[model samples]
Target chain A: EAALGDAKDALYAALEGMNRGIFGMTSEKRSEIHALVELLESKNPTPEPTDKLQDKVDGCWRLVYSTISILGKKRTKLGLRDFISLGDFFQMIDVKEEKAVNVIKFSARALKILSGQLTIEASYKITTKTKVDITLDSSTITPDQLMNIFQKNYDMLLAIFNPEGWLEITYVDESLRIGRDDKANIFVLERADPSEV
Target chain B: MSVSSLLEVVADDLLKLNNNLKSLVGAENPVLVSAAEQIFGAGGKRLRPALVFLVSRATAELAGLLELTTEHQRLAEIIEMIHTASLIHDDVIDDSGMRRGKETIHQLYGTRVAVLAGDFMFAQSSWFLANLENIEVIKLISQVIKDFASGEIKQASTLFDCDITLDDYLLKSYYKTASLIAASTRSAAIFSGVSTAICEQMYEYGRNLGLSFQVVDDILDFTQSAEQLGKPAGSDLAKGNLTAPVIFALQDEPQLREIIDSEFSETNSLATAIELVHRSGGIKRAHELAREKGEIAIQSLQCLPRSEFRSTLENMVKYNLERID
Candidate 1:
């Protein structure tokens, strides 16, 4: 029990440090970052929630880290700060009274050529203590409608909603939650303060 | 025979190359097999593999070595696979709907499947490359993948960036297109066990040819009709890629720079930009640059012994120029 507490504290500290920046970090620091993540995973063998997960998960959160793969090659670890530096990105998930709303926004400037903004929204259901299934249920627009919007205005927020997929919450707390999607892509999020929301 | 009949001479080998690619795809995954067949079946110029085979034959004959070996044929197929894989990824990145007069992989399949298909081709190419058992060739060809990725990143970063210089443009061109061609040509020379001098000369020849090829391609974006190109005209400019003509036009017509900086995303800006580029003599200047590079490409072949293969190589330069004219 003590070891788990110590590991969780270390992970939170590391996440806070990474929240500041991850780009151009020294090799040693990068190694330490990976090691801390590994330690957290080791301590948390199962992700089953001890209490009601819906109550804990209902709030806005800021992305801290994500993993993306290209052409079968896993890309380097990207931190939220790196993306925030390029543009604005945030996610909000609220699950209360058996109703859930999940929203994600990403906007960035591509040099002087163009700027792109994307938003994804969906409804989710907690299938298991550690797993949630999210389905695209946007009332506003679909991809085809977004295409029509893009033809007229390239700078509009293009919405995308892929089919429902499972997300496994591996670790969770009042301030931080680590989850993995069906593709095994890891995502780390920190609770957003009221001002940020 | 004339340059136009060059591929006809090696028609048998080209068929064999296609068969090899088909067998490699096999019948296991229907989705992958279908995508691979569609991509390769839609005819390409197959210029890179032709270069590999031609350069190999030329160098082998010059060195008084044996005829084209199985390794040479395998290497040629590998080159085509790599080139095809790059095209697949390029279509996805550019959001292109058509390639080679047919729907692109990304358009036919989704982006995720298209990406996987491209990766599958790379895996097949890499497997064949390792089987070649030549560390030097493997190392040289592997560098091209890195170069391709770096070029994509650079282009993405420089989108709509008007401050990009001629040097930056040329460097990006080499990374995106020329690097593979140059590497394949040099690898063919190495396979023939040619002299180091000849190998270096072949690399130079390919490098210059690639540069000329890209310059003409950029020029065609302005000169060719959408029907001729099988895609929209002024597509690169619309995508915010400032090609050679736009780069040069910015110097003469300063107003063009202001329009691009402020109103490029407007619906009518692409047409306005194209007209400005033409009126400023940017297209003519770009043609002159292409011709100069074509001359250098031909001159680089002087060191090789005179043969029909060498003549065919020289004619490639002529073909590029003729196409432009």
Candidate 2:
């Protein structure tokens, strides 16, 4: 029997060198990724995923594209305009703990450039095989200056990368998984080495 | 602490549970009744009911009820009955001669009797589930029976596939062992009329504890002997049901995969695979994994008001990890 179209690979092929969409994306690129994700979800092998393909749901996943953003003042304050460089985003799902750790990597050039992660943690449950109920547990920026900077406007920070709501697992395979949250935000993530974080 | 010590909180309630469970089946056929009763009659480990009883009391306490509810006892009864069903079906599938050093249901009454015996109890449990009348509780309990089938196919299809991940093992572990145990805790709280937040934490408690207990059991499958488990050590691994230890070991040991991939075809290959699971630091990492889960289980209990029942619940988590220590 012929194995169907390589939706997963084609999708990966599109995301091979993308920077996890930290610098933002053009509308054209965003539309293309959305189309590719739709193609993959149509051929989803694990219909009810959380109960079935657990490893796919449990380990570390790197964010490739998200419909969420920090615009205007919040973006400039976070230095997405230039002085500070935004890096990849990663989310770790610890099924045993019923918790999630979302890490947003960044590098700020002050006297010198310093890199750190803003960690947003949430408690979640596999409410259904395809939907995860996530409520924000806490958030922190590591080290000194970055922590000091983000704590001033915590709610503003959440406006961009908050995972405080339920996410529907629209597409998932061995290496790639996609989700849409209650806020109508869509996210694309790929399986990452668990050892990395 | 030992399980006996941890179970002390609910010891009085559990004393007559088996005697009471025999009639709940209400089986019409004599052989089927006998088959169902046989396992219930031989019961020593009723861990699921113990969880139900503890969660019920603690949550009842949180709800400011002076004592537990009749529905709580009935819920525990249903949990045990379903567990009894699990045992009978497992006997028919495994086709074993003895379980816990006694004759299995199939061995005594034949396979059809055993299958019907298991099926009847599930149907009975379902009836009890509806009678409880909480859709939340009913749905959670109903999921366990179906999850049991999917868990098996997941395990059977992935046998000896060395590329399986740690989450693969935990999720399979969840379906096979944790699902019912989690339902036991969550539903117990639901019967208390507590907030959804509290009820869900009870689930987190059971989920983490169940996973912790499973990892410890797998560790023992390599470290302990037949004297303790009633089967040879590494039996699950020998069957290619890769568990926590084997999954962790697979990360570093390239050689381990060859033996497991070959399905242990050579002489004493099963023993060698088991040997490498220990030597490859799988057991140690698995130990850490169990403790990590154990810590999360303990944290879930902080929501319950301070009481002996809650303390006893904490002790249960300690007792599970103590086995590995």
Candidate 3:
């Protein structure tokens, strides 16, 4: 029990300042975090997240790390070179409703550094014991003014952030989850109090 | 032909295990000796010792030896002791009153004596394991002990957790059941001076067979009739252990999902739930999974030549599945 908790703590420590991998990692640090990820997976409490859909997967989760990087045409397209930067990412799962909401908080600099979010909604079906097939139903960029700037590149945003296709829930527990997508991306999330994140 | 000479290559030798162990643990404490006598003195299939001998004999024949080594004989006792020690503690941890058609150690002497007896046995098993002097086998048995603790804790923490995966279930199963068996066979092979490759093959055989054994045990909980199995059907489910059958059934049976989440609140829920499992092919799927594991075990056996001992090992896998129908 002590060992498992320590492993979780060490992984969190490694991820503390990685910006969820939005900022590139040192090769050595990448290997370190990946090793910790493998170690955690080996000790996963809920190996099958589907069977535990209600108990383990429900409740809001804050993304701690992700491999899904933003587009470069949008590095400047979203004015990433000087202004646009991603904010805290959160995923809300409703197992009973068979729906999920992905909120990627975003901010842009210019006088006031306006804040907004990209809300992508998707539904998931348990296609196998370990994998879920996700269907993206709708998406929106919030705060009408910020929405007006990013709405033009919705396809590009959806191309990278699309919650469509398969997501294999490699590991999950009461407080933590790790997933791999068909897009060759990995995700790590921590249980977040609904009101906090 | 009396008793086990016919079943042998090893069953007759397993009879020797009690005589061997009987003399050793008697002086520790009256209660320890008393519990040890009831557990070790009982006539039954000592599975780990039997596994050690079979692997020892098969691997030795492959290496062209007329006799098995003392290290082989030594490991059988160590494995049995480690397994028995685990059960002594497990009986207490589970608060189980009955086991092996007899009262458990905890039931006989209560937790105070039972826990002390388990610790004494473990402390003594380590002493003997150290005496074996083979670092490799020593490391293996030590790891098995570690796994025993980890597996038990996992089971303890995950009680009635509906979302456990088959992989997680099997790993936990491996920890409690298969790990010692795997170490038993591999250590026996290691003593036989076979190549590590053959030793590992022996381990694969033990690993898969033990998994098959546990799955069959779980299936029999629901599949066996009153006359065939003494315990009631759904005994595990009543306690929220939720083995393979329930795990698979919960995939499709929303009604079952409701019943389990309710923790069998209805008087007839447990009884009706067993039928739901049968109707949903949960037991059938478990049978297939058991056979799948058995097949892997059989394949691992192919590395050994055509010998009666090897054949018996293969038959053991089949016999476990044969319990289902």
Candidate 4:
């Protein structure tokens, strides 16, 4: 229990470090983050992770960042969405209640962070297609401007996974419980495509 | 005495422990009665009990403890139960079809029954310990069981995770094997009224020796034939679990990462993984690590009086070194 407490505390510290680091980065650094975000969002629109699940998502984000931060030093092709999927996978197999909760938190957080970097148009498109009701008023911006916005977001996402703060997400979820209140007991997401390949 | 002679001593004690274990399992519920009979009839090496007897003798305390029948037998029975419980759980977790060259309990009775059987044995081991006159031994072994379960879960989840290091493997070995071996020896020394300092030495000594022995076991998976090992060669790696040798091997080959990332199917084979470790000099490095640990085990005995038991303990470390070579 002492060790676990230590790990969780360390995780919180690392999460804070990542958030501050992101906020302080120059446009060049932020541009890299936008790139990775755009690359992933271009494939699939941002999925909403909110309410009670929002806390869980935030935890999952930290888990992924912490993991990627450690692992990116060794390997480069790694990204946040993949780590989110990993967190999901880990929660599925872990038997302990606390460990399962930590894993879920990591998954939700990863999805949330990745979602935050999506272009408004792409977000609108994804939200509309997924049947999530959300509207975007982008009449002022031309298609070229919209593409540039998406490109900028992609660069920012890229920055998130790049050298300095690369976190490895080792979470895995083999469960289908779509939401807490769902009774279908059926697997919702199958075979995550974070790389969109 | 030679290492073979020490093994012979271990084998004999193991047979006695197995007999006791059989009786204990038989007297329980009829449902388990048949299954217990099948497992007991099938038999095991009874490695944990043997470690207890060997270490006790190695410390020159065995002679005085012969008359301490109640304490000695109870200690041996409880450890045997713990070891048996570990084996049953391992079989189920590994989905092992056969154990000791026969149908495994899980294979014969199904997974749920096998799980319950292992859980029951664990409960019985704890219950037996709870009755021990020494409360310290009860708490110590109970803690070992807790460590053992956590280690098992960690091992299960970490399998095939390329990041698992040799240190992780060693920690698991300590939890799954050395803790029981060391506990048994510590309990035996405590019963004999050996000085705390001497008992502590024996505990460390047993722990290191058990670790070295397990390292040798991992090596033998590559060096020995299936007939010699009584299991398939490189079985540990085959299960997606990287042992010390492979960890060493991964150091030199930058490309090994590709093998790790790919879901290794048997059709593709683990040849690259094996070769990477072999070429990286991981196997030899691992052997050196084991010898270093064994030397530490020998150093722990500097305070003990010179005796054949001490000689046996020292020789046991050498025997472990020679096993893989």
Candidate 3, B4-26: lDDT as tens digits: 44245665677677777877876
Q: What tens-digit string does per-residue lDDT give for candidate 2 at B106-190?
A: 7787887777777877887788788887887787777888899888665544655657677777788899788888888888878
Q: Which ten residues in a row have the lowest lDDT in candidate 2 chain B?
A: B153-162
Q: Which residue pairs clash in candidate 1? A: A113-B160
Candidate 1 chain A minimal-lDDT segment of 10 residues = A69-78
- Candidate 4's displacement at residue A26, Å, is 41
Supply DockQ values for each candidate.
0.02, 0.01, 0.01, 0.03
Top-lDDT candidate index:
3
What candidate 4 gets wrong by more than 4 Å, as runs, is A1-197, B1-4, B7-16, B28-34, B41-44, B57-66, B225-235, B265-269
Q: What's the ranking of the predictions by DockQ, best on top?
A: 4, 1, 3, 2
The clash count for each model shown is 1, 0, 0, 46
Residue lDDT tens for model 4, B26-135: 57678778888777653345456666665556544534544445667788888877777788878877565555567777778888788887877878877777778688
Ranking by lDDT: 3, 2, 1, 4
Q: What DockQ was computed for model 2? A: 0.01
